Amino acid sequence: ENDFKYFDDIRPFLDEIYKTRERYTPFYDDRADYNTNSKSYYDYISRLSKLIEVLARRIWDYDNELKKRFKNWDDLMKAFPEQAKDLFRGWLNDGT
């Protein structure tokens, strides 16, 4: 069919920037000295400060996660004789 003209309504706005993109120098001027203000050191430690605190807290609170993870080790230890006797009553069913 002649459908899917979504690749096609872009065309009058894709030739347009190709027209006004590189033919500029007879139409405009190069003057007026626009100032550029770009990011001193305080924005640099801005970029670094949130980044270090967002892992500073996330290694400060590693202890409670690790505390969980060596709590369930001992949970497995106290659960183990139950699992051993449960495994033992399995085989003697066919055993007896």
Interface residues toward other proteins, by CB under 8 A: 40-41, 44-45, 48-49, 52, 55-56, 59-60, 62-63, 66, 69-70, 73, 76-77, 81, 84-85, 87-89, 91-92, 95-96
Residue 43: burial class (beta carbons within 10 Å; 0-12, 13-18, 19+): exposed
- Residue 16 or 43 having the CB closest to other proteins: 43
How many whole angstroms separate alpha carbon 10 and alpha carbon 16? Answer: 10
Which residue blocks in 25-61 are alpha helix, DSSP H?
A: 41-60
Residue 71 C-beta: closest distance to other proteins, Å: 12
Least CB distance to other proteins at residue 38 (A): 13
Burial class (CB in 10 A: 0-12, 13-18, 19+), 3: exposed
Nearer to other proteins, 4 or 41 (CB): 41
* Minimum CB distance to other proteins, residue 86 (Å): 10
